[PDB]
């Protein structure tokens, strides 16, 4: 049905919004952003 497909729209929207806000709020703490200092 269209429920299955539509669920992807909302899931992806929230997932990308959070996975773009989180690595902005925490960019100073995550690994991928700190690894440069210790390399």
């Amino acid at each position: 049905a269209t429920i299955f497909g539509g669920a992807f729209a909302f899931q992806g929207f929230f997932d990308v919004a959070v996975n773009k806000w989180w690595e902005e709020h925490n960019k100073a703490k995550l690994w991928k952003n700190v690894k440069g200092k210790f390399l």
Partner: protein, 244 residues
């Protein structure tokens, strides 16, 4: 119990990872792992952490692999039946300094330094406690208390007597990123690393939690609206009773 028995309650330090939306300071995780290997590995096992767990958290895969080769592990004995050993690999768990609890107790005046892979989730104060424990040693034990031989006084330890004795001292470790190595800095780093080791899902857990709260809060508001809307006919009913 007496205040001494329960142990002084550790305060609440504003850790970088307390709030609902902050991750671990992975810089602090790496520094804490450095302090661990440098100091704590003399006594503490920390078995449940495998080198693979460090890739993408505090060490690049190459560094974890290299740290793996630096150690020796027991392999399946050769086809001739003789024991054989291999350099460590990522899948291998970090090795403790003692072969068994008997050895650990023998080498520490009978005290058994607990495995640290769950020490943060296995203590009342959590991370704070560890910090308060590592920097809670007073230069002069409170007057009147007599400690059993080999024990050192730490108010945050239940009973007031802990076999550890202060370990973190100023400039004991040269951090890889040039961070100063004050005893408080080392204590914070070790506490953060041990908290990660006891809660490797912390960052993923809180991110999933944020997504779940967003979804469920929007959905709960929608449900509130839908219920009030579909109940408007009932809450707006008006009756009359007109008998003769």
């Amino acid at each position: 119990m007496t205040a001494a028995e329960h142990g002084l309650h550790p305060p609440a330090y504003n850790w970088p990872h307390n709030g609902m939306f902050e991750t671990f300071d992975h810089a602090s995780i790496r520094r804490g792992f450095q302090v661990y290997r440098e100091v704590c590995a003399a006594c503490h096992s920390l078995d449940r952490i495998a080198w693979r767990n460090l890739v993408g958290v505090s060490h690049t895969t190459s560094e974890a692999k290299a740290m793996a080769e630096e150690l020796e592990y027991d392999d399946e004995p050769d086809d001739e039946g003789k024991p054989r050993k291999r350099p460590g690999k990522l899948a291998d768990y970090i090795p403790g300094p003692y072969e068994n609890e008997q050895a650990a107790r023998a080498a520490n005046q009978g005290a058994y330094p607990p495995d640290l892979s769950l020490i943060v989730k296995a203590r009342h104060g959590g991370s704070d406690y560890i910090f308060s424990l590592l920097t809670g040693y007073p230069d002069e034990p409170p007057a009147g208390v007599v400690l059993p031989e080999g024990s050192n006084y730490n108010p945050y330890f239940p009973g007031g007597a802990i076999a550890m004795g202060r370990v973190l001292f100023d400039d004991l470790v040269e951090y890889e990123d040039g961070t100063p190595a004050t005893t408080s800095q080392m204590a914070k780093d070790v506490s953060t690393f041990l908290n990660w080791a006891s809660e490797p899902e912390h960052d993923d857990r809180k991110k999933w939690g944020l997504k779940a709260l967003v979804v469920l809060s929007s959905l709960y508001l929608l449900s509130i609206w839908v219920k009030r809307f579909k109940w408007t006919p009932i809450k707006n009913r008006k009756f009359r009773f007109d008998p003769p």
